[PDB]
Structure 1
Amino acid sequence: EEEELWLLTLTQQFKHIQKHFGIDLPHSVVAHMDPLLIKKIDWETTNALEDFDITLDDMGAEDAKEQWGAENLSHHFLPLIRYRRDLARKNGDRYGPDLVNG
């Protein structure tokens, strides 16, 4: 039960999106459930990169396309790593993935 809230939030949010996307899901519920994804997509629209995935598969970039998708959904693991960073700060150590060679 230590990190059940984050995993079950991810599960419930994507289950609702996938059940309703492309059928009847409003954009307000999408921007409510996933605010930072909408923020990053609006950054791509604001900064003239609205065709950035079209640009990436126009130039054959598959790894950069997967990196683009994974960096736009990188805030899903932000609650977990903030929780684990504060656990390691309560136990006097440092969080492992925050380090360069460690």
Structure 2
Amino acid sequence: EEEELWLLTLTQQFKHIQKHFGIDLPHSVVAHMDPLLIKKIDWETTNALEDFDITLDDMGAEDAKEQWGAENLSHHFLPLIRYRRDLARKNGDRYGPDLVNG
């Protein structure tokens, strides 16, 4: 029960999207559910990088393409690391993934 809330939220959100995306899902709901993802996609459009993914496909940069998509969804893990960092901090411990050699 320690971190069940975060795991259940991702499942619920992704399932609802897949059930309606490309069919009848409204754009307003998408930004409400995942505002940070929209904030990333619209930034690329504002910074003249709307075709960045297409550019990577032209050069076949598979590693960059995978990193690009992963970074666009990396905020999904932010709540878990913030909670785990706070747990370590109240106990005075340092969080592993935060360290250079961790």
TM range (shorter): over 0.9
Shift of 1:63: 0.8
CA distances 1:1-57 after superposition (whole Å, capped 9, x unpaired): 100110000000000000000000000110011100000001100000000100011
Distance (Å, rounded) in 1 between the aligned partners of 2:89 and 2:29: 35
Residue 64 of structure 1 deviates from its aligned partner by 0.4
Partners of 1:33 and 1:58 lie apart in 2 by 32
Runs (4 or more) in structure 1 with deviation over 3 Å come to: none
Give % identity: 100
CA-based RMSD: 0.4
Structure 1 residue 82: deviation in Å?
Answer: 0.2
TM-score, normalising length from structure 2? Answer: 0.99
Question: What CA deviation, in whole Å up to 9, does each residue of 1:45-98 have, x standing for no partner?
Answer: 000000010001111101100100000000000000000000000111111000
Stretches of structure 1 that go unaligned for 5 or more consecutive residues are none
Alignment of 1:9-48 (within 5 A): 9-48=9-48
Give the TM-score normalised by the residue count of structure 1.
Answer: 0.99
* Alignment: residue pair count: 102
